[PDB]
Amino acid sequence: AVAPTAREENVYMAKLAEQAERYEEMVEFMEKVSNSLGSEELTVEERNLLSVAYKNVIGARRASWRIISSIEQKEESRGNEEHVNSIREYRSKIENELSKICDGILKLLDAKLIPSAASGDSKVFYLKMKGDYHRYLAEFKTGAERKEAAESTLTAYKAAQDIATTELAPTHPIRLGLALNFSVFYYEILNSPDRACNLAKQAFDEAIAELSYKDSTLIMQLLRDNLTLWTSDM
């Protein structure tokens, strides 16, 4: 049997891991794929797998964090100081993991993924990633640590948008996905809902004006969903 190369076995194992809900392994596998490439470009499929792997791994911690915060809100209501401190002790351990994960991918993005990026596409992809993980930090960091994080997010999304907006069609899944997240950053991190509605609505409008499909249409549905949520809430 001809031994599979490191690249091909670990791309396949990432795909098994994803189907199997073994997302920490999926990261392990995609990092092995990344090492077999040095600073050469990942394919579309390879980078999508890598993004999905970190998306899920951090997602799980984002979800845990949101749930625990709601339990803590209810308990701040019900005046249960003892429970509130336990939840707080615990939300912390969660925040350490989020930190650690974020630092991991951010380091890979700065050292390998972003300078590898040839086409605008790929450059938008990676700078979006870099925006997102700084945003995830911003979600829970306090005053100065938040500002640093918000600062790093803006500068990545602004750099992505300046490429996407001039190099990619309004209908491009990555332009679309960037506007989604950039708009969210404004709504949730900066708390500027007018700025958020403006950006989201513009990306949606430019895209609508231009009418492959499947991913674009999903992200456009999400833009619309967000816009309708943010308005009924004004």
């Binding site: 949101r66 749930i67 709601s70 339990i71 809100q73 209810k74 549905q221 999400l222 967000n226």
Partner: protein
């Protein structure tokens, strides 16, 4: 109750189910909301937007 009408209601519910599936699969908010539904967590709705 008319077939064509029932058939269309089925198609519309199926179209929306399919969007609901993509949200739950691909978004933090979809995922989080289903986890609270599944568990039936006695918590008040978490404020969330969709990100990808």
């Amino acid at each position: 109750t008319n077939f064509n009408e029932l058939n269309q209601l089925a198609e519309e519910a199926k179209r929306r189910a399919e969007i609901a599936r993509q949200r739950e699969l691909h978004t933090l908010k979809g995922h989080v909301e289903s986890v609270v539904k599944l568990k039936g967590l006695d918590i008040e709705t978490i404020q969330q937007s969709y990100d990808i």
